[PDB]
Design a protein around this ligand. Sequence first.
Ligand SMILES: NC(=O)C1=CN([C@@H]2O[C@H](COP(=O)(O)OP(=O)(O)OC[C@H]3O[C@@H](n4cnc5c(N)ncnc54)[C@H](OP(=O)(O)O)[C@@H]3O)[C@@H](O)[C@H]2O)C=CC1
Ligand SMILES: CN(c1cnc2nc(N)nc(N)c2c1)c1cccc2ccccc12
Length: 206
Amino acid sequence: MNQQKSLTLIVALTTSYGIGRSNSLPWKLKKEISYFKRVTSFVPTFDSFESMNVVLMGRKTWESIPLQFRPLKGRINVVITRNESLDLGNGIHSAKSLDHALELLYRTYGSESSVQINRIFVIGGAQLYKAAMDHPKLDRIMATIIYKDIHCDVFFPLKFRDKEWSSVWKKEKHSDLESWVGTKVPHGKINEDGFDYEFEMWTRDL
Ligand SMILES: NC(=O)C1=CN([C@@H]2O[C@H](COP(=O)(O)OP(=O)(O)OC[C@H]3O[C@@H](n4cnc5c(N)ncnc54)[C@H](OP(=O)(O)O)[C@@H]3O)[C@@H](O)[C@H]2O)C=CC1
Ligand SMILES: CN(c1cnc2nc(N)nc(N)c2c1)c1cccc2ccccc12
């Protein structure tokens, strides 16, 4: 009654797999955030009357989001934590592992529910990404590649863009990224703050 939907991981990372520094992002990129909001929120119009997407995140990520921007609007939010007592407020969901989140969601939003789930995203941090990369239902990575070896202290756990992983993970064409994301997405290099970045989509076979 569960293992039926695929998981999609969304991440912005340097060419050295850096994702974080001092409990925050190593960059300030407003349009990169707008893309993250766009992808994580998008539900096809017909299904958008009743269906929403879900963002799964680690408790340090949840705490890293300035309060002004939490919970992430227009998406079902779930925080992964072993702190049974952490009070999320506003009902925000809490779960003790990736699979306990999945069971909670399916229980909460089943055929007996006004709200239905469309897509499920894993949105960080490194610890939850490590669990997600080990999960048998993770098949897609929406990666924002940042072309600067910006100093980081937290790293993405599996080098999916490298030669060692290239029989399993493959980068899809931009049109395929767009057909998946449901809208036209900026193609090629964007420079918001002194370095280039670009949007990619990587998939593997389940
Ligand atoms: N560049 C990007 O795209 C992103 C970067 N980041 C960066 O990641 C860094 C934070 O990453 P990290 O320190 O790894 O933190 P996480 O956000 O992964 O949160 C870790 C905490 O989440 C809970 N948790 C995570 N995974 C599991 C699990 N598999 N099972 C049970 N509990 C789990 C635990 O909570 P508890 O301790 O309460 O039990 C753990 O202490 C920051 O620098 C942040 O800015 C974050 C998201 C995106
Ligand atoms: C968890 N997070 C974040 C930011 N950008 C991301 N970019 C990509 N491509 N992928 C992610 N998982 C992101 C997460 C955030 C970290 C800090 C502030 C945020 C404000 C609004 C939305 C997300 C915020």
